[PDB]
Amino acid sequence: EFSVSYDDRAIIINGKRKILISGSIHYPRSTPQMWPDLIQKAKDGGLDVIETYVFWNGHEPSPGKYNFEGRYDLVRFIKMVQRAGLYVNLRIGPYVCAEWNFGGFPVWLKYVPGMEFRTNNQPFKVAMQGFVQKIVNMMKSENLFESQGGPIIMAQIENAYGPVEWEIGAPGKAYTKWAAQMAVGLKTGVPWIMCKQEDAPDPVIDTCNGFYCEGFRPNKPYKPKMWTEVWTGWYTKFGGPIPQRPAEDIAFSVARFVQNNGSFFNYYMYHGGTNFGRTSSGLFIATSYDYDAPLDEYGLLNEPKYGHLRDLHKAIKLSEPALVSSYAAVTSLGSNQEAHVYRSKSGACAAFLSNYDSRYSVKVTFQNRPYNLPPWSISILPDCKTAVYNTAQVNSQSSSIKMTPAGGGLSWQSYNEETPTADDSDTLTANGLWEQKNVTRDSSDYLWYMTNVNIASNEGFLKNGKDPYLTVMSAGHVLHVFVNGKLSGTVYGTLDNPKLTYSGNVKLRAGINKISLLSVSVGLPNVGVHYDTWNAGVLGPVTLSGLNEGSRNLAKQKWSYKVGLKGESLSLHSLSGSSSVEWVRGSLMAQKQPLTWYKATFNAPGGNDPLALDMASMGKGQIWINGEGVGRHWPGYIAQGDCSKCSYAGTFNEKKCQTNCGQPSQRWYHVPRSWLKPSGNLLVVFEEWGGNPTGISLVRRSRSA
Ligand SMILES: *[C@@H]1O[C@H](CO)[C@@H](O[C@@H]2O[C@H](CO)[C@@H](O)[C@H](O)[C@H]2NC(C)=O)[C@H](O)[C@H]1NC(C)=O
Ligand SMILES: OC[C@H]1O[C@@H](O[C@@H]2[C@@H](O)[C@H](O)O[C@H](CO)[C@@H]2O)[C@H](O)[C@@H](O)[C@H]1O
Ligand SMILES: *[C@@H]1O[C@H](CO)[C@@H](O)[C@H](O)[C@H]1NC(C)=O
């Protein structure tokens, strides 16, 4: 009655094989209020399944203390998908990558005794078996696995370990074995998948991720061919362009897979959404996870991509009865043109006509009728006769993004952040420099490195008007340099190379000089071999040239630390906290001023358009609406990179259809309709870089052809 098994062909849901069209919708990147409309948009788009990760570090802020409220009501989210007649692929992880802060591991886990991440390690295995079992027991509890009549038809253990395992060697393989056996062991009564495991143990199905994976094949023949991440674009990194992937090529990629015994494919992403707060953003990942997905960050339809995939699904579902009762058989149709024919003993016939030439439309002869195949396309013939769909012919009207203000420029108040300096009574100190994750435990992006640089009165630069050289080398990711109160320097990294060096002459004078270094993180690293062990914050070396001695090693003094900002320790983002300091009303409003808090109240704009914040006036920091973390703003970083005009045809890569070069890397910042009330809306912004808060205006998203 209720069963999920599999064969060499496809997934068997209820004794019936199925070709499963699926979409990734990460729950914590939406509001619970948006969930059902997004899920409905998915249903209308031709999706059978909704895929998501579980967010380990969202769910356990500290050991044993869990959070499944609001955006993290996972059981609610799965139930809502079930409510929509769609299935669920639950990729538990707990490592999930997903451009998510620290890959999803809680930071506290890093510091458990004897701990190592993703390897045959006792502390790690225990904590991981722990979380995976808690989630599965929560899922089992309300019969949410399909064997019990629920939506979950599949689960994922780890995420993309194959590459990491190929480098760690024997521990890695001894952990891949372990992870598979001690997840299957939870007896969920539905299959377990692993993506990028050329070596996944029976009975775990290895899947792939990529732009194209028509070449792929499971690690044993009685496993079906499964595509867990059809990338629908790419992530937007801070100071990067907005990566698009064209819909004629996504169609083309999916059809290339399904024509070749493809049975499960999942768009990553279907809905991208927002990295809300300082707990979401992976390293350098911008607040927008829009991902050029078929639903944009704001849940509106990305046309014609949405419409064009909707039609492809329809064309697949007309083909499905053939697809499930035969196998993909091939027949050359010319130099670079092919035919994949699903012909059932009963009489069903589905035919995929392919044309792999990236330049020239080609006409082929199939079963006596002519067919014109536009270049880099496939024509779907669900009857083997009428081409009802072609992955180049786009029959959905486009829709372009328009942001149009409403609410009017608000009246602002300011508050300035203390620029702290060393004090002979600081408690948190050491000789030499400490790593940032170690000190902050990721309670805040901000860490103050402070020390005393004494300068003897007989110095060369105290004779000739001249400044000593300051050189600071920090693991990342932003660094502000403060001398005796005033700001001497500001340097920042990219995703690829987050390490930085500040070099510059610095006005010191005889006696004790104050050095205060503000190192900031932009989320934690989320991917790579041993990514967890990477450093952040100032580890040096730190020198001061132009002295008599010659060049002073400042890394070998007493340094003192202070975690995070005062405004944070006050929580000036919440209504209670924001009424506790003297705000600077009137016209003295700090303009183009570093380390400044801002504050305005406004009324919900008109009706039912999605909203955002224009902040191209500002530099960098965080936004909060009504005490909830909107996310990080960083319009000060200008999109670096190639932005050639783009053709659908030919092999794709992230870099192909890059957009928005020269502009702020994210101008607009998403604000849920569900986070506003009619009036009394407390906007609070921390500006870390300097900007003019008068230019902050609310906007409405809408689209037209
Ligand atoms: C789809 O799957 C079928 C089944 O695996 C593939 O056809 C097989 O081809 C191999 C040799 O290449 C034979 O050993 C199998 O017995 C074949 N099965 C059948 C039913 O013919 C087929 O190649 C796959 N499709 C594509 C496009 O590769
Ligand atoms: O949206 C990005 C996507 O990355 C996937 O991971 C990929 C790896 O499987 C592959 O080996 O390298 C890619 C970069 O070249 C990338 O790291 C994740 O599976 C997925 O969660 C998501 O982060
Ligand atoms: C981490 O911090 C602890 C306690 O605050 C300290 O004992 C240790 O030296 C630090 N280690 C680092 C930065 O590697």
Side-chain angles (χ1 to χ4, degrees), residues 338 636 690:
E338 226 174 21

Coordinates of all heavy atoms in Angstrom, one line a residue, residues 338 636 690:
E338 N 21.1 13.3 -33.0 CA 20.8 11.9 -32.4 C 19.3 11.7 -32.2 O 18.6 12.7 -32.2 CB 21.6 11.8 -31.1 CG 22.4 10.6 -30.9 CD 23.3 10.6 -29.7 OE1 23.0 11.4 -28.8 OE2 24.3 9.8 -29.6
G636 N 28.8 48.8 -1.3 CA 30.1 49.4 -1.4 C 31.1 48.6 -2.3 O 31.9 49.2 -2.9
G690 N 30.3 54.0 6.2 CA 29.9 55.4 5.9 C 29.0 55.4 4.7 O 29.3 54.7 3.7

